[PDB]
Amino acid sequence: KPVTVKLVDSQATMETRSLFAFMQEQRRHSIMFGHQHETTQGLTITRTDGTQSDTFNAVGDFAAVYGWDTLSIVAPKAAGDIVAQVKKAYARGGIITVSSHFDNPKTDTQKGVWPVGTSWDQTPAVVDSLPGGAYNPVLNGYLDQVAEWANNLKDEQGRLIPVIFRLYHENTGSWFWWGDKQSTPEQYKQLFRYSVEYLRDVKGVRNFLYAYSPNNFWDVTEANYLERYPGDEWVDVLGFDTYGPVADNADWFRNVVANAALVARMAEARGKIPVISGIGIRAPDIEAGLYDNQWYRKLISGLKADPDAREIAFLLVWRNAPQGVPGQVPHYWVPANRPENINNGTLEDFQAFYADEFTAFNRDIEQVYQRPTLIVK
Numbered sequence: 063k064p065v066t067v068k069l070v071d072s073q074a075t076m077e078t079r080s081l082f083a084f085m086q087e088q089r090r091h092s093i094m095f096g097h098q099h100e101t102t103q104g105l106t107i108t109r110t111d112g113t114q115s116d117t118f119n120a121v122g123d124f125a126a127v128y129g130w131d132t133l134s135i136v137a138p139k140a141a142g143d144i145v146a147q148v149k150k151a152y153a154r155g156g157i158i159t160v161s162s163h164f165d166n167p168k169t170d171t172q173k174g175v176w177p178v179g180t181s182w183d184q185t186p187a188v189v190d191s192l193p194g195g196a197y198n199p200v201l202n203g204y205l206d207q208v209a210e211w212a213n214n215l216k217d218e219q220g221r222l223i224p225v226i227f228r229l230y231h232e233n234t235g236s237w238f239w240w241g242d243k244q245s246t247p248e249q250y251k252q253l254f255r256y257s258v259e260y261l262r263d264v265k266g267v268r269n270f271l272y273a274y275s276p277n278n279f280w281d282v283t284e285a286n287y288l289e290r291y292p293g294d295e296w297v298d299v300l301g302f303d304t305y306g307p308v309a310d311n312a313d314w315f316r317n318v319v320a321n322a323a324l325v326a327r328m329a330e331a332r333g334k335i336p337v338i339s340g341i342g343i344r345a346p347d348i349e350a351g352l353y354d355n356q357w358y359r360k361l362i363s364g365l366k367a368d369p370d371a372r373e374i375a376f377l378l379v380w381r382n383a384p385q386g387v388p389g390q391v392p393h394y395w396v397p398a399n400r401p402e403n404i405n406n407g408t409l410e411d412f413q414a415f416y417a418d419e420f421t422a423f424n425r426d427i428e429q430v431y432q433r434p435t436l437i438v439k
């Protein structure tokens with residue numbers, strides 16, 4: 063049966079429309095597991111060509127949702143090209159999402175001392191990057207490259223590969239140049255809308271669903287989520303990102319569930335897909351060598367028990383850095399099939415999460431892209 067969909071891009075390809083329809087249905091039957099750099103970064107992988115993952119080595123299947131970033135698309139592509147690996151993920155029926163760690167359009171010529179000129183350069187650049195602003199051409203250059211990438215991202219039959227494109231995330235904090243100290247809510251909304259319009263209307267991107275993802279709220283209300291929300295005309299996917307303590311984390315887990323419940327209820331009301339677009343133990347705790355060997359079991363237990371939170375389409379955890387990060391300190395979220403994670407109980411935790419009937423990995427999702435749809439618009 064053909065389902066009626068209303069997308070940000072009413073001219074989206076049939077496969078893109080199908081992806082939306084798939085998640086609309088699937089989300090009330092499972093939660094898909096997502097992983098950033100699934101087949102491009104791992105502690106246990108010997109090839110980064112898109113054929114291996116730490117997830118696969120841990121549980122025998124890939125993540126259902128594959129996350130990557132504009133750090134692999136926009137010059138200087140610090141994270142490396144991902145076209146081949148995206149194509150491999152799509153060929154095995156996976157779902158692709160790309161987040162936007164854009165450089166700072168006001169300061170990107172000044173790179174040298176980290177974090178100058180990067181997403182993490184907190185110099186406000188929202189006002190300055192909108193049309194009329196001096197750095198609008200710099201932002202447009204980034205968007206040009208995203209569009210060229212999207213417009214040429216084709217499968218073996220020459221059809222465009224759908225991507226869930228997540229823009230200006232974690233915007234309710236101030237660690238990024240598009241954050242809440244860097245912009246009024248109206249200015250942020252304009253940046254998001256301008257960028258979607260540029261991609262869709264100026265550059266003709268037809269294979270994107272658009273995702274919005276602030277941080278978790280501690281005062282979990284619709285009014286709070288709506289303050290910087292770009293609007294129903296501009297967003298297909300309602301998400302949030304949340305990172306918590308490794309220890310004494312019951313309150314944080316309740317907050318995860320509350321935020322997921324909110325986005326799920328909002329998504330049903332607004333005809334959107336609710337997701338958790340980024341979730342994990344906070345990086346500093348992992349980097350200190352700490353672990354919670356019940357983390358994944360607590361996550362799935364809490365989510366599936368709640369009648370609203372359970373309705374999210376996916377949750378995504380962050381990258382498994384093969385050599386960690388400079389402190390080298392560990393920086394990974396999927397427990398690896400190796401002595402350290404066997405011994406500390408985290409591998410068992412993740413294997414139990416995989417075994418859970420409500421989690422969906424890559425072999426658990428079928429006919430994602432061939433569903434008939436009608437479009438409103």
Ligand SMILES: OC[C@H]1O[C@@H](O[C@H]2[C@H](O)[C@H](O)[C@@H](O)O[C@@H]2CO)[C@@H](O)[C@@H](O)[C@@H]1O
Nearest residue numbers: 131133163232303340344345380381387
């Ligand atoms: O891959 C881009 C950088 O990602 C960082 O990880 C952050 C991420 O920026 C988000 O804030 C959220 O997902 O939390 C993640 C973990 O703290 C780090 O992995 C950097 O090393 C990357 O360059």
Ligand code: NA
Nearest residue numbers: 089092372374
């Ligand atoms: Na679900």
Ligand SMILES: [Zn+2]
Nearest residue numbers: 087088090091
């Ligand atoms: Zn159903």
